[PDB]
């Protein structure tokens, strides 16, 4: 069988297919709750959490950690909604050539409220910063 370009996904059982899968997931992390929420933020006149990090740090210096994290709660039907990153963007970078560790909370994910994986990511960057000085 042949497929139209829209529906085709490279065979996941190949290295190229696995790279394509990683690209798809990375692209999804850009708008974890849909492009409508990003548009709402911009219309409100604010920057997204990612835009804030990219604006603060030097260009091309951001390395993100736990980008694909998801929450593991099952209470009150939370399991039906598991946005990537769980509402906080964490990583490290440079400001004026000097290394820093950074986190930025995302108000579009559960109102920006802190969950377990959220807090775990923040703890990870805090430990990294203390460790690296």
């Amino acid at each position: 069988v042949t497929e139209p370009s829209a529906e085709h996904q490279v065979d996941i059982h190949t290295t190229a297919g696995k790279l394509a899968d990683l690209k798809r997931r990375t692209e999804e992390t850009l708008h974890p709750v849909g492009e409508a929420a990003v548009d709402k933020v911009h219309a409100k006149g604010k920057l997204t959490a990612r835009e804030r990090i990219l604006a603060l740090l030097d260009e091309g210096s951001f390395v993100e950690l736990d980008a694909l994290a998801k929450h593991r709660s099952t209470n009150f039907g939370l399991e039906k909604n598991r946005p990537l990153g769980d509402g906080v963007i964490t990583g490290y970078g440079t400001i004026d050539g000097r290394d820093v560790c950074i986190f930025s909370q995302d108000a579009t994910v559960f109102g920006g409220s802190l969950g377990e994986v959220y807090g775990e990511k923040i703890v990870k960057v805090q430990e990294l910063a203390i460790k690296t000085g």
Binding site: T2, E3, S5, V10, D11, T14, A16
Partner: protein, 592 residues
């Protein structure tokens, strides 16, 4: 029926060309792409795109069922095969016709007859074309070859009856080489093409390659759109072409034109096709082949004659009679250069890589038909061609001057190409000529050209000084614009601050594993030297082999590379099978 939607069953610059022709004619276009081509220009250019799947041609473009399924799903009522792949597959043509789609090409019977060399020889003889002396029928033994050599004088060329791609011919200089050459030719033909039949003819010493472009309709009309000279060849495949054929007497020119028409009419040929001849140093013409596909060279004839050959081919497929009644008069002179992803300084050996930059020339007399753009990646599975640069002028001298300009402008980065060779040849006196003749021939590049091109190295730092960072600045000194590069540790005058408390500069080591002296330091594994496809496996597990014995044959860039045993021992743990794609460093087998 009339073409309404064309499926281009090809890839690259030819796919782009046919898609553009369909757009010009107002027809819908459907492209089919393998997984490596998911982002090629043609996939985006075509009105529709379909994913054949598979990582190699044997499972992507050479599958009749996949191409026909794409046609069925897209609703395309015509199929155009480009060139290569299935363009000369009579079985595929008949399959398309049976499926009930307009096959944009010659009939399957014409394909068969003109693809069978001996049948082609019969057709040419019946058409009274100029032929070189040779055996009318396949030779049965080296004894017959020896008798023919005695009769007609050495050298003598032995050619496979179904050979193509330049691999199907070998030469004997003396009567003693005939037996070994015969047996090896038969053994290689049975393997490369299935059929081991071969025949023998006279070999020309320094021949030119001249071909005629023929546009023939289904109503019996045939028109010779022009002649081309393709005397510059790496091994037996063209690199640079001209239109019209330079320095040919009117007698030779009219002989070619008439022989081409006669051959096509005797073969019943229709659609765009080409007739290839050879012209020896004596001036004698010798019919060589009939290509039943659209030549890659066609743009030079398009420029000189002012005809759209792809659209003519659409019309012929539609069944309309030719709207051209006489051979067009050439205007100007056009050169064509193939931009192959090969390193001229390394014996023209193709290698894959990314096109990190691609800036084509533009302006007077320049046409560029490319299948890649900046950001494209050349894998190891398909042909090395990236684009074709056509430069047209009022005369041959004007075309050469414009070609020098255009090749100076043309820029590619990320992988090697043949631009340095084109730049050198367009100024070599042997190619310029004396105004009445020139010294180029089919073997000129590989045996007479003074190859001054150094191997491609990209931006890799090789020497100790290459490791120092640099900043490039624009400086105006008395108006003059200068582009000055400054090292990061320049101690000019009293300037200092060089290096750091413990910084040492040293010659970097190449990203290669040692050398031959440690080919396998207690290493039993046989590792693939390059990415490609295992097209042959010459051993089986438990087989004893000696150093130099062939283990596998990997096809990369449509060229075969043999991987041989590095040590004496028993083949153990054979890990690959024919048709398996292989990455560099993969363990093929362990010799123990």
């Amino acid at each position: 029926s009339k073409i309404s939607k064309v499926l281009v069953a090809n890839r690259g610059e030819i796919a782009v060309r046919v898609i553009r022709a369909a757009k010009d004619a107002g027809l819908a276009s459907v492209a089919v792409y393998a997984e490596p081509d998911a982002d090629a220009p043609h996939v985006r250019l075509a009105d529709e795109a379909f994913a054949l799947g598979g990582q190699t041609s044997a499972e992507s473009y050479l599958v009749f069922e996949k191409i026909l399924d794409a046609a069925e799903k897209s609703g395309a009522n015509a199929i155009h095969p480009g060139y290569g792949f299935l363009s000369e597959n009579a079985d595929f043509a008949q399959a398309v016709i049976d499926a009930g789609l307009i096959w944009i090409g010659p009939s399957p019977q014409s394909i068969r007859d003109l693809g069978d060399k001996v049948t082609a020889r019969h057709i040419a003889a019946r058409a009274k074309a100029p032929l070189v002396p040779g055996t009318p029928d396949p030779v049965k033994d080296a004894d017959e070859v020896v008798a023919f050599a005695k009769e007609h004088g050495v050298p003598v060329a032995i050619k496979a009856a179904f050979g193509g791609g330049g691999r199907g011919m070998k030469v004997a200089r003396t009567l003693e080489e005939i037996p070994e050459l015969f047996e090896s030719a038969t053994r290689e033909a049975i393997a490369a093409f299935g059929r081991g039949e071969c025949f023998v003819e006279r070999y020309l010493d320094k021949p030119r390659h001249v071909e005629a472009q023929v546009i023939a309709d289904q109503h019996g009309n045939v028109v010779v759109a022009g002649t081309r000279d393709c005397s510059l060849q790496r091994r037996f495949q063209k690199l640079v072409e001209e239109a019209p054929a330079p320095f040919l007497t009117d007698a030779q020119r009219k002989e070619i034109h008439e022989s081409a028409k006669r051959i096509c009419k005797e073969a019943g040929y229709y659609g765009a096709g080409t007739v290839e001849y050879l012209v020896g140093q004596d001036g004698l013409i010798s019919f060589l082949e009939v290509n039943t596909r659209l030549q890659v060279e066609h743009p030079v004839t398009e420029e000189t004659s002012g005809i759209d050959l792809v659209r003519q081919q659409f019309k012929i497929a539609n069944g309309e009679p030719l709207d051209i009644t006489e051979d067009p008069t050439p205007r100007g002179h056009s050169f064509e250069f193939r931009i192959n992803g090969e390193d001229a300084g390394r014996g023209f050996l193709p290698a894959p890589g990314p096109v990190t930059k691609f800036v084509a020339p533009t302006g007077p007399g320049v046409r560029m038909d490319s299948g890649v753009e900046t950001g494209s990646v050349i894998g190891g599975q398909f042909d090395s061609m990236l684009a074709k640069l056509i430069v047209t002028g009022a005369t041959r001298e004007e075309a050469l001057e414009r070609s020098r300009r255009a090749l100076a402008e043309f820029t590619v980065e990320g992988l090697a190409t043949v631009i340095p060779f084109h730049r050198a040849v367009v100024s070599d006196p042997a190619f310029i000529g004396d105004g009445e003749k020139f010294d180029v021939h089919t073997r000129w590049i590989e045996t007479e050209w003074n190859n001054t091109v150094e191997p491609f190295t990209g931006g890799d730092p090789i020497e100790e000084e290459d490791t120092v960072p640099r900043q490039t600045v624009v400086v105006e000194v008395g108006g003059r614009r200068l582009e000055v590069s400054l090292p990061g540790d320049l101690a000019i005058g009293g300037g200092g601050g060089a290096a750091a408390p413990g910084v040492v500069r040293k010659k970097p080591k190449p990203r290669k594993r040692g050398g031959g002296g440690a080919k396998a330091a207690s290493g039993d594994a046989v590792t693939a030297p390059m990415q490609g496809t295992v097209v042959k496996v010459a051993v089986e597990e438990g087989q004893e082999v000696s150093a130099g014995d062939l283990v596998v044959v990997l096809e990369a860039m449509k060229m075969e590379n043999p991987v041989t045993a590095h040590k004496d021992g028993t083949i153990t743990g054979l890990a690959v099978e024919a048709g398996a794609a292989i990455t560099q460093g993969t363990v093929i087998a362990e010799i123990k």
